[PDB]
Amino acid sequence: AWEMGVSDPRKIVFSAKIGLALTIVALLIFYQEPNPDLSRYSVWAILTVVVVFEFTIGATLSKGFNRALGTLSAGGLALGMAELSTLFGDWEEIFCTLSIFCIGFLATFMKLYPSMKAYEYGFRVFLLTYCYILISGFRTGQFIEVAISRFLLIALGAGVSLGVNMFIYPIWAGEDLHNLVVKNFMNVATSLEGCVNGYLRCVYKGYRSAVESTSQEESLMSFAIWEPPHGPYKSFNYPWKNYVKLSGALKHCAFTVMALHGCILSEIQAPEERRQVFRQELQRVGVEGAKLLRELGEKVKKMEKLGPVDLLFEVHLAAEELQHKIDKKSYLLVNSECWETYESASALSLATFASLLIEFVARLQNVVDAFKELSQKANFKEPE
Amino acid sequence: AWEMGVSDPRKIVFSAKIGLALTIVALLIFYQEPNPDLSRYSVWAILTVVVVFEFTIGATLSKGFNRALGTLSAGGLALGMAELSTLFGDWEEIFCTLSIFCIGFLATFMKLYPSMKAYEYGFRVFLLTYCYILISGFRTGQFIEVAISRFLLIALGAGVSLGVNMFIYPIWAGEDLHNLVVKNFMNVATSLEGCVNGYLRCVYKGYRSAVESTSQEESLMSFAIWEPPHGPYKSFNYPWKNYVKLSGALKHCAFTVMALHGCILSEIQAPEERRQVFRQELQRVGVEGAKLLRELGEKVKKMEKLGPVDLLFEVHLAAEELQHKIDKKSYLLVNSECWETYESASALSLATFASLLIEFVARLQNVVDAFKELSQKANFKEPE
Numbered sequence: 014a015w016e017m018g019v020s021d022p023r024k025i026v027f028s029a030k031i032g033l034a035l036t037i038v039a040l041l042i043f044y045q046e047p048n049p050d051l052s053r054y055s056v057w058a059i060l061t062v063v064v065v066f067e068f069t070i071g072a073t074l075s076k077g078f079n080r081a082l083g084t085l086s087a088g089g090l091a092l093g094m095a096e097l098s099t100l101f102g103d104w105e106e107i108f109c110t111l112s113i114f115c116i117g118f119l120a121t122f123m124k125l126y127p128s129m130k131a132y133e134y135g136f137r138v139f140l141l142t143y144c145y146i147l148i149s150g151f152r153t154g155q156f157i158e159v160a161i162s163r164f165l166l167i168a169l170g171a172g173v174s175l176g177v178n179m180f181i182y183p184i185w186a187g188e189d190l191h192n193l194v195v196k197n198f199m200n201v202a203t204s205l206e207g208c209v210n211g212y213l214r215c216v217y218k219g220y221r222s223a224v225e226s227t228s229q230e231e232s233l234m235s236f237a238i239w240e241p242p243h244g245p246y247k248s249f250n251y252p253w254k255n256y257v258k259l260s261g262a263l264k265h266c267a268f269t270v271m272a273l274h275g276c277i278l279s280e281i282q283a284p285e286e287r288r289q290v291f292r293q294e295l296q297r298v299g300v301e302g303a304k305l306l307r308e309l310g311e312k313v314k315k316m317e318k319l320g321p322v323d324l325l326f327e328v329h330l331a332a333e334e335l336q337h338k339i340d341k342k343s344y345l346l347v348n349s350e351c352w353e354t355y356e357s358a359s360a361l362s363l364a365t366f367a368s369l370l371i372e373f374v375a376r377l378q379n380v381v382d383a384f385k386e387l388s389q390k391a392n393f394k395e396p397e
Numbered sequence: 398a399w400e401m402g403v404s405d406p407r408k409i410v411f412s413a414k415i416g417l418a419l420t421i422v423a424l425l426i427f428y429q430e431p432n433p434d435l436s437r438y439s440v441w442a443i444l445t446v447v448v449v450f451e452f453t454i455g456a457t458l459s460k461g462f463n464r465a466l467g468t469l470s471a472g473g474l475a476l477g478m479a480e481l482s483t484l485f486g487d488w489e490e491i492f493c494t495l496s497i498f499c500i501g502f503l504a505t506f507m508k509l510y511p512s513m514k515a516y517e518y519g520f521r522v523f524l525l526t527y528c529y530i531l532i533s534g535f536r537t538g539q540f541i542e543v544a545i546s547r548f549l550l551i552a553l554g555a556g557v558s559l560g561v562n563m564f565i566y567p568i569w570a571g572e573d574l575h576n577l578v579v580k581n582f583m584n585v586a587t588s589l590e591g592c593v594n595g596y597l598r599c600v601y602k603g604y605r606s607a608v609e610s611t612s613q614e615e616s617l618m619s620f621a622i623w624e625p626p627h628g629p630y631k632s633f634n635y636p637w638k639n640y641v642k643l644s645g646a647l648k649h650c651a652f653t654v655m656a657l658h659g660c661i662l663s664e665i666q667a668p669e670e671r672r673q674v675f676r677q678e679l680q681r682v683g684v685e686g687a688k689l690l691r692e693l694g695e696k697v698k699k700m701e702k703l704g705p706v707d708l709l710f711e712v713h714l715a716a717e718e719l720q721h722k723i724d725k726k727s728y729l730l731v732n733s734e735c736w737e738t739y740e741s742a743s744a745l746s747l748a749t750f751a752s753l754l755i756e757f758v759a760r761l762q763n764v765v766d767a768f769k770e771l772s773q774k775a776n777f778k779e780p781e
């Protein structure tokens with residue numbers, strides 16, 4: 014729609030690049046001179062554009078490699094089977110019927126495994142190609158030289174698709190991974206402050222997105238290893254795995270924010286008057302943690318190295334101040350009258366928030382370690 | 398491999414059914430008498446078997462309705478466009494190229510909305526059909542009496558696929574949903590015991606499956622409404638949504654077990670000497686909760702109603718005993734010496750573990766209420 018297009022103007026360009034490739038193919042088809050070989054079977058060239066045109070360059074290269082491997086293997090096996098069938102001379106229609114059963118059984122069985130679950134598009138092309146070659150080459154009997162004219166058009170369609178996809182506003186999966194890693198830091202930094210403000214008041218998509226994107230980052234990393242060097246990523250083998258390592262450390266840090274958010278929806282809650290004692294100490298930690306996460310995200314985005322000053326000094330000091338405050342007023346969290354039930358559970362429930370906050374601060378040193386590793390493997394610019 | 402056959406023997410029945418349908422079609426094709434139309438185009442029937450065969454029966458009905466809708470809309474638009482194009486006369490190829498560009502842009506833009514992620518297969522059978530009908534019907538001027546003969550072979554392949562799929566050992570999505578719901582209770586029950594035992598030692602897939610398969614239940618629900626009555630689910634409008642409501646309540650209860658597991662991986666851990674004091678109470682709650690979850694899962698499995706006894710009496714008693722114990726020995730969690738850092742946090746972690754366990758026991762009434770509602774909407778039988 015208008016809103017969807019304006020929000021992400023990329024989709025309009027992708028739709029008009031697909032329309033351009035279809036027009037550039039239909040013009041050749043409709044103006045080509047008559048031929049005895051490609052004047053009736055030319056349709057196989059405009060339907061390849063609709064099947065091999067993906068959203069990124071790396072996806073197009075990898076999927077096209079898989080489809081060409083399946084097609085060439087199915088064609089070689091079908092040619093061998095057809096040549097071998099003639100030996101019997103009287104049960105050809107039975108041998109060719111048993112071949113279909115055997116190959117279809119194995120092709121279906123092998124595509125249901127829990128490992129090759131993302132490559133069913135390459136198994137289906139094998140199953141369609143074996144059947145097409147075996148059935149269409151029975152009456153004619155010379156599909157050897159007819160199967161290459163149907164691959165020449167496929168090659169023309171895939172060449173046009175790749176040229177139009179690559180030389181007109183390409184979309185790179187590496188930049189997608191870079192942008193996603195930059196965006197997760199801001200999502201977590203917003204959620205942490207929303208949780209602290211909601212609890213102290215007299216938050217979902219942040220950690221939801223930061224915890225449910227491991228598959229997306231893995232797929233984007235798989236696509237990114239095919240693309241050639243370009244732009245700022247000037248190196249033969251860029252270290253794309255350190256981006257996944259930094260996102261794993263960030264998710265380990267965001268699981269405590271998810272626990273903090275779940276502390277607000279619980280059935281048992283402490284009285285509002287008791288929460289107001291630790292307001293300043295609770296707010297300072299959220300402020301410093303969000304500042305740190307935004308500073309790390311900004312350094313990642315600009316491809317810059319960490320400065321010489323310690324970044325964790327302020328948050329560490331705030332955590333120590335909160336600990337001392339908790340120690341001073343510890344008698345609010347328990348009752349010494351019984352020292353040797355809803356009210357007691359409520360009173361003890363106010364210390365879970367502070368214990369989880371201190372554990373969140375304790376988990377922040379491994380994100381800095383992973384960032385230093387990434388800033389070293391990939392040559393980041395020296396700070397100004 | 399071979400072991401996968403024994404683990405799930407129904408994937409070998411699926412592969413053999415696929416081979417059976419392929420060989421029935423190949424046996425009709427290899428023996429059909431010569432005809433003026435089917436002697437050369439009888440390969441469109443065996444290709445449809447490989448496209449419209451699905452694991453379940455409701456997925457086959459739903460995706461064959463989507464595919465037939467796309468094919469017929471595309472064919473009607475293409476024929477009307479060709480007839481309107483002939484009116485222009487000259488520049489007719491300019492008109493056809495413009496039409497192909499506009500339709501390709503629209504069909505590419507409409508399959509990118511985030512509300513249509515699951516129908517990106519019913520949008521791709523419309524652009525192939527439009528381009529096929531427009532390009533192949535230009536050099537003869539007649540493509541209306543041939544498309545009728547090209548659709549009969551498709552309807553024959555789809556009729557054979559559905560007959561063989563539905564009359565030889567069918568698989569039902571409602572049974573898959575029923576079994577998934579029954580297995581979630583077992584997984585959560587095993588995870589709670591694993592977490593408590595691991596904490597008290599001198600777990601992951603359990604809650605992971607329950608909290609990481611929400612879309613699976615909705616996909617099986619979308620397929621299950623298309624299937625006819627059968628077996629014990631003898632009702633035209635089966636409340637398949639109450640299974641989803643029960644799974645949602647169980648997921649809400651599994652989010653606390655996730656945090657109980659996370660307490661073991663923290664960087665701050667309490668001393669074991671203080672841990673040993675609260676051992677019998679923790680184990681009693683850890684066994685009562687698992688026995689209740691396994692009883693609810695068993696009563697869902699056999700479709701039986703709740704008895705006259707109260708299932709939550711024992712867990713409530715164990716929780717009250719744990720709270721009284723915490724109240725007696727509360728002086729070990731806090732220090733009264735400085736009443737008005739690492740050691741204090743380590744001591745305070747015990748209260749977090751106890752509080753999370755108590756919240757787990759406090760959230761079970763929602764699951765019991767959901768089970769009672771499900772056993773009311775569907776006619777569950779009376780106990781014994």
Ligand SMILES: CCCCCCCCCCCCCCCCCC(=O)OC[C@H](COP(=O)(O)O)OC(=O)CCCCCCCCCCCCCCCCC
Pocket residue numbers: 060064080084085088089092134135137138141142145146160161163164448468469471472473525526529544545547548
């Ligand atoms: C109103 C009247 C309306 C009536 C309606 C009339 C019906 C109109 C019919 C239009 C049908 C045309 C649609 C296009 C066909 C469907 C495509 C499809 O669905 O499949 C997708 C399916 C899945 O695609 P993917 O998952 O995206 O990869 O596979 C395909 O892409 C198409 C493959 C077709 C099989 C071609 C096999 C060719 C043989 C190999 C070539 C020779 C190489 C061997 C070399 C020798 C080696 C030594």
Ligand SMILES: CCCCCCCCCCCCCCCC(=O)O
Pocket residue numbers: 056057060061064065077080081084138167168171172
């Ligand atoms: C009825 C027309 C059918 C046309 C089906 C086209 C499907 C093509 C699938 C094979 C893609 C091969 C990718 C390009 C390989 C290469 O360029 O060498």
Ligand SMILES: CCCCCCCCCCCCCCCC(=O)O
Pocket residue numbers: 441444445448449461464465468522551552555556
């Ligand atoms: C040429 C390749 C074939 C591609 C087929 C894609 C379109 C599939 C449409 C399936 C509709 C089947 C209708 C069956 C009618 C019935 O038996 O009730």
